[PDB]
Design a protein around this ligand. Sequence first.
Ligand SMILES: Nc1nc2c(ncn2CCOCCP(=O)(O)O)c(=O)[nH]1
Ligand SMILES: Nc1nc2c(ncn2CCOCCP(=O)(O)O)c(=O)[nH]1
Ligand SMILES: Nc1nc2c(ncn2CCOCCP(=O)(O)O)c(=O)[nH]1
Ligand SMILES: Nc1nc2c(ncn2CCOCCP(=O)(O)O)c(=O)[nH]1
Lengths: 211, 214, 211, 214
Amino acid sequence: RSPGVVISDDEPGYDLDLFCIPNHYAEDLERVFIPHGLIMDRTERLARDVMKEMGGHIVALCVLKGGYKFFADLLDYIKALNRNSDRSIPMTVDFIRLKSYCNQSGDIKVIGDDLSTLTGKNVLIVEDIIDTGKTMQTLLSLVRQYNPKMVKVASLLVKRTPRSVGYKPDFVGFEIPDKFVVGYALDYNEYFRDLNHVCVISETGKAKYKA
Amino acid sequence: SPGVVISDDEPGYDLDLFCIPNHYAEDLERVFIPHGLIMDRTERLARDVMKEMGGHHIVALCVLKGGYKFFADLLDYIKALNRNSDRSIPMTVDFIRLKSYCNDQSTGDIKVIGGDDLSTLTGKNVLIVEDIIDTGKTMQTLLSLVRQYNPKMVKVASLLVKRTPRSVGYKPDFVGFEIPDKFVVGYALDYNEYFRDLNHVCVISETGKAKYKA
Amino acid sequence: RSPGVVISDDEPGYDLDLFCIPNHYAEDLERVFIPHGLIMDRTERLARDVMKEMGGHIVALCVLKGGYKFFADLLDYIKALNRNSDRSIPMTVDFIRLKSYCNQSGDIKVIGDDLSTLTGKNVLIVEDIIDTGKTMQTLLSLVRQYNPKMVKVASLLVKRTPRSVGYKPDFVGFEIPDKFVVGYALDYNEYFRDLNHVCVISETGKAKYKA
Amino acid sequence: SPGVVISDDEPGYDLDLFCIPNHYAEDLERVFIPHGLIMDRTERLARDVMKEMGGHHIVALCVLKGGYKFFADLLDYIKALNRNSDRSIPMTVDFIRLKSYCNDQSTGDIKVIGGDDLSTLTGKNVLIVEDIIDTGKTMQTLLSLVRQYNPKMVKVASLLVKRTPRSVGYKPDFVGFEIPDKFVVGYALDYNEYFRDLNHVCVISETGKAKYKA
Ligand SMILES: Nc1nc2c(ncn2CCOCCP(=O)(O)O)c(=O)[nH]1
Ligand SMILES: Nc1nc2c(ncn2CCOCCP(=O)(O)O)c(=O)[nH]1
Ligand SMILES: Nc1nc2c(ncn2CCOCCP(=O)(O)O)c(=O)[nH]1
Ligand SMILES: Nc1nc2c(ncn2CCOCCP(=O)(O)O)c(=O)[nH]1
């Protein structure tokens, strides 16, 4: 139903020397997958798609600490679309905090708080990347608890991985191979935030940016 | 330095001079600060921030009321400055979420909601980011909370500081703009979920104050 | 009829340390007058105003070598407005080269070439700054020669100076004091091109950036 | 390096994936290069340009057919790199205007119009900027003209190089993207004054080729 921009397993992304990359990350990356500008353009069409469905009303729900970058960009584009409406349209930003921990055995989620502003509203879940689908599934049954009118998921990234298949996202920026990516929205123990593009972390970068 | 001082004298900018959404044509008095002006100042603030806190870790803490547009923007420029460093410097981004109470007759009373492991701040260099400071009571009482977790040093940055007799004297370390004692909306400041799509800082008109009130 | 954003003689512009300025220009400027971002915003409203009048058709006329920056920015905003039209709208960019020389006595203008694409069209003259008004007056009688349907002038800058008063511009970005400005569109013997803001050149900068 | 190689294999991007003006909904086949992608590559090109020509003067010469969007953009990124230099490095920006003839069956025949004091180029470091190279005949004969004024060194930069058997083998020094042998519009390439407002490089469809023809 729109798998988004499909980046296939075969020969993925771009050679490092084709784009501008912070020099201090020269050894910490393997290839580049999605240049920043390309993320921007897709995010724009995405915002157009969100208004089609949404817009009764809209509550955009950010996932805190981590997800702020993509949320901000997605919302900037929506604001950009909203400037031309003949009646000014109310829009509410919301926030859940959510942290995950490496598991022996079973998944660990630590949630969020104060979600009164959801009752009978159109709620958009914004995520950064979908791998196992647990974050999405958690955010789901959580908002379902507060009796909203509508619920969609938007996620910049869907990884091509084994999952329980539970709730397939409604809006997908990019469908990428099973590789570990950083930059743009995704840090690695606080590094790569200054990296605008989504790139594959290398082995040098993994060992260098400890934890 | 008190930032870009916008005078009581001749206020800001006539409305037809800049691009504004048709649906607010009636809901504003003046433009104080066009979007591009906010960006240019913010770029400078970010430079100023790296001068005093650069190299060291820094934890960027966003005072999160209704939105964080300013924070997002300050942090993009800061990330842009860090693109050059020989060593990549880890940047910790966090949020402290505040819910609004008694309207605004006593803003010094904070009710923090998004207050995860506040003890991360300890022994760390904290930059606290705010969008507007008015009476100064929110911040001064937020400072009291943050300092009890003993950071290595705290600096505050505010896009806008309002020049009011109702001020309790608290001055941020970094000021974007010092503005007249009038109620503003736009860029980062919403009004009952409105003006989110307004790029500029403009004074809210009375027909707009009434059309959009809770 | 819209004097544009009036920057008065009294206490003009901003202190240098309030904005980001290339370090190698630290001594070469006095104050800053119009930050880049501010130029952008005004240029946007300007593009909106141009479409009101123009749009039958439109030929935007750039003044070559010098004027490319502002033209490009003004046109980018117009393109941005044109995306939403229900019928795609043809737009023609044109070019005259024009150079001036310090005068003994009388003005020197060296013109341009190939302006067949003007007959019965709506022509916009784009300039960078208006001081004496000779450039504007020259561009005027020049296009008048090719029997256009319409003629307007847009200029980012109008200086508050003695002039022959001949043809007052239709669109004006900013009305600035009688000071010598550089940056954004205005170089000084090839310097300040990397400067985004319009600032007053200092005496140190004048003597340093020779000729 | 032949730039970002876009394959003959799977072309570019489906139209509904990106934002495109409604009035061209029918006039395109595929998107090859979204605007943001063009910006990111161009940023890199500019870096590459300063590596080999940095510090020295450089005269940036724009091959000006219908527009100069690419040139303007390359030069903004170059100016952005020069913001850091200890000495400010003077940059000379010039244009060489070419009018189109015999349609395009013999593009090697240039007719230069905007050719002011060509003898400025002499003893100077020239970067020649072009938006697309197809058969390569325009450039190779432009090179012959420019070299007769004996510069100190000439480099060429092209946003797009088309991979065609009709190519005479000329390769620019700097390539943005190497693309399939299909007729493209958008970003910098207009079609009879159309697609100026199209941000992306997209293949022109046949219903668009006909609706917009001279
Ligand atoms: N930076 C970075 N993080 C990754 C990546 N893959 C997983 N993660 C961990 C966070 O994403 C979890 C989503 P889920 O709840 O498993 O659906 C990655 O490719 N880059
Ligand atoms: N949008 C908008 N909000 C305003 C304004 N003034 C106060 N507020 C409320 C938030 O600022 C209070 C912080 P404080 O504790 O008083 O320093 C305003 O002029 N615009
Ligand atoms: N950089 C720079 N140049 C200036 C300035 N003032 C004049 N000039 C010279 C070019 O402008 C001539 C316009 P005219 O034909 O006299 O109406 C200036 O304040 N900065
Ligand atoms: N818009 C557009 N124009 C094209 C295209 N192909 C050729 N042209 C004409 C200009 O390029 C010719 C230069 P050359 O001398 O052949 O190297 C195209 O695919 N799109």
